[PDB]
Design a protein around this ligand. Structure first.
Ligand SMILES: [Mg+2]
Ligand SMILES: [Mg+2]
Ligand SMILES: [Mg+2]
Ligand SMILES: [Mg+2]
Ligand SMILES: [Mg+2]
Ligand SMILES: [Mg+2]
Ligand SMILES: [Mg+2]
Ligand SMILES: [Mg+2]
Ligand SMILES: [Mg+2]
Ligand SMILES: [Mg+2]
Ligand SMILES: [Mg+2]
Ligand SMILES: [Mg+2]
Ligand SMILES: [Mg+2]
Ligand SMILES: [Mg+2]
Ligand SMILES: [Mg+2]
Ligand SMILES: [Mg+2]
Ligand SMILES: [Mg+2]
Ligand SMILES: [Mg+2]
Ligand SMILES: [Mg+2]
Ligand SMILES: [Mg+2]
Ligand SMILES: [Mg+2]
Ligand SMILES: [Mg+2]
Ligand SMILES: [Mg+2]
Ligand SMILES: [Mg+2]
Ligand SMILES: [Mg+2]
Ligand SMILES: [Mg+2]
Ligand SMILES: [Mg+2]
Ligand SMILES: [Mg+2]
Ligand SMILES: [Mg+2]
Ligand SMILES: [Mg+2]
Ligand SMILES: [Mg+2]
Ligand SMILES: [Mg+2]
Ligand SMILES: [Mg+2]
Ligand SMILES: [Mg+2]
Ligand SMILES: [Mg+2]
Lengths: 70, 116, 155
RNA sequence: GUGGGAGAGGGUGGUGGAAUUCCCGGAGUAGCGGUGAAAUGCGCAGAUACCGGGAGGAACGCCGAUGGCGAAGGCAGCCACCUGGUCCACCCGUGACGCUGAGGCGCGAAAGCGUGGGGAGCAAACCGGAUUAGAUACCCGGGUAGUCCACGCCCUAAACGAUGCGCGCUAGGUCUCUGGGUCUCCUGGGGGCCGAAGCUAACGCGUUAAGCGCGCCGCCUGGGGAGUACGGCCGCAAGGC
């Protein structure tokens, strides 16, 4: 399976406003994806988590979602 | 006396019971059923067969209301949490989609001693 | 059978029909090791069943044993306290054995005086779809479709 | 000193969503709940389930790790402000200014105390239902103090790495966090795992020493009696030394 960073550009991990690329790092639900599927380093993941939370509070990223087909 | 022709179906399954509430597209319920609505009384209500019978009885009451297309919502875990959806699929109601919307907190409340 | 599969005994064919189910039934009629008396019972019953109804005793025997074979039964399984009756299907070999046993036990539970008469009338009733052996079979099947609520305990 | 860096380190104020409970409303019947079975309990004054709205308290899912920070206790949503510790590179400045530390002083999980707030969920005591030979328990239904906040006490613990602090010396291998570098790698500084020499009664330790040495502090001298008695000190008390 593909990891998120593998298929992506040279993007800002500190931009909480870019929903287009921050959406890639959320799961089918609103959960933040682990490092196994994001292909990020520890520091990169630690920054991405805070930026994702920032975007969530701004109503840009979903706090949680609903699972399908279950 | 409603002629709803389409709606949602919520399956609330626990380890002590399974109940199905069939509702309209904007949330108000139409019919419902459970392991106690049908004959079973005690722990027998938590068996997958009771869940199947409850889903089927609720689906037939929905037929009495005139239900054809159904969207499924699932909350909780227990024996027959899936059997309810299987019977609901083969009940004669065209299943639109199945969704698991089990409510999980963000670590807000302290559980009972059983749950720690 | 802890180690092996307990290979099934292959019964000798029959001297009259050439069929193995007849020898198996004759064994089920035998008691105290008297296969001669049991064979005489079964074959005088064959004459009686071929005369009182003008059909071949071969196919009536086969149809009766086929009518008595059940398709489901119950076994007890220990789960969460006291055990429960769990339904399940049957092996063909076990269907054969149970059918023949119910045949003999329902034949000897009959009022008829002579043994061959009991055997013949029991085979007749079982071939028609009624009788005591088919009643026990349908009670075995009625155990199924009743406790089917435990269909998730198949094992 | 300069220039960079990581962080649930601490304090203050703000702020977000999920969930529980409760209240308002809609729609909707006959049960829900609970257990190994059950019963108490709740429900026709309309519950449970579903939908919308409101209130309030407490805690921060995914990220999360075998991770990080702190002297220890301990510290997880997000934002801002105030502030501590620490690491690296440069080789710049002072020029032995160091190490340890009886006493003292400060900090010190939870529970507990006092005054005043707060109160969803949980829940000692307690009230019931079961189970059992009995049930004063485990299991179920309720439920107060408490848990939360402000301020002042309390000074205990398996307060654990059961390993005091500092420095130097003594094979490596492997995973990792964070810096620097001419960036298959090297070089610092933390977190683990194997294992040289050596140590150990053994288990095991082994550059994060329980090895080889040095400095300083604390403590030990058979078990029970007993962390008890008396005395003193501290404390509102419980009680602690
Ligand atoms: Mg139940
Ligand atoms: Mg912090
Ligand atoms: Mg802070
Ligand atoms: Mg209401
Ligand atoms: Mg009432
Ligand atoms: Mg009542
Ligand atoms: Mg009442
Ligand atoms: Mg209130
Ligand atoms: Mg976790
Ligand atoms: Mg700082
Ligand atoms: Mg110099
Ligand atoms: Mg000089
Ligand atoms: Mg010192
Ligand atoms: Mg001191
Ligand atoms: Mg304290
Ligand atoms: Mg406290
Ligand atoms: Mg108090
Ligand atoms: Mg409670
Ligand atoms: Mg009692
Ligand atoms: Mg209780
Ligand atoms: Mg020493
Ligand atoms: Mg580098
Ligand atoms: Mg540390
Ligand atoms: Mg190292
Ligand atoms: Mg190492
Ligand atoms: Mg050695
Ligand atoms: Mg070792
Ligand atoms: Mg050393
Ligand atoms: Mg030693
Ligand atoms: Mg002492
Ligand atoms: Mg002594
Ligand atoms: Mg003591
Ligand atoms: Mg004293
Ligand atoms: Mg005094
Ligand atoms: Mg004491």
């Amino acid at each position: 399976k593909a990891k998120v960073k593998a298929t992506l550009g040279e993007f800002d991990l500190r931009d909480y406003r870019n929903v287009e690329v921050l959406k890639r790092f959320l799961s089918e639900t609103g959960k933040i994806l682990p490092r196994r599927r994001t292909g990020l380093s520890a520091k990169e993941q630690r920054i991405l988590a805070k930026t994702i939370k920032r975007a969530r509070i701004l109503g840009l990223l979903p706090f949680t979602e609903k699972l399908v087909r279950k | 006396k409603r002629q709803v022709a389409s709606g949602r179906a919520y399956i609330h399954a626990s380890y002590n019971n399974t109940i199905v509430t069939i509702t309209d597209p904007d949330g108000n319920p139409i019919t419902w059923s459970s392991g106690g609505v049908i004959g079973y009384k005690g722990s027998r209500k938590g068996t997958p067969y009771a869940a199947q019978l409850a889903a089927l009885d609720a689906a037939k009451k929905a037929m009495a209301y005139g239900m054809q297309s159904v969207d499924v919502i699932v909350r909780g875990t227990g024996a027959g949490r899936e059997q309810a959806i299987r019977a609901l699929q083969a009940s004669g109601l065209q299943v639109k989609s199945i969704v698991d919307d089990t409510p999980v907190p963000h670590n807000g409340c302290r559980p009972k001693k059983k749950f720690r | 059978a802890r180690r092996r599969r307990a290979e099934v005994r292959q019964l000798q064919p029959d001297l009259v029909y050439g069929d193995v189910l007849v020898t198996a039934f004759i064994n089920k009629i035998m008691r105290d090791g008297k296969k001669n008396l049991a064979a005489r019972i079964f074959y005088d019953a064959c004459k009686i069943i071929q005369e009182k109804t003008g059909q071949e005793p071969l196919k009536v025997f086969k149809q009766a044993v086929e009518n008595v074979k059940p398709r489901m039964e119950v076994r007890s399984r220990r789960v969460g306290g006291a055990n429960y009756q769990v339904p399940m299907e049957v092996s063909p070999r076990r269907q054969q054995s149970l059918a023949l046993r119910w045949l003999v036990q329902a034949a000897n539970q009959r009022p008829e005086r002579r043994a061959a008469v009991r055997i013949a009338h029991e085979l007749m009733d079982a071939a028609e779809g009624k009788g005591g052996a088919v009643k026990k079979k349908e009670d075995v099947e009625r155990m199924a479709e009743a406790n089917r609520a435990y269909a998730h305990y198949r094992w």
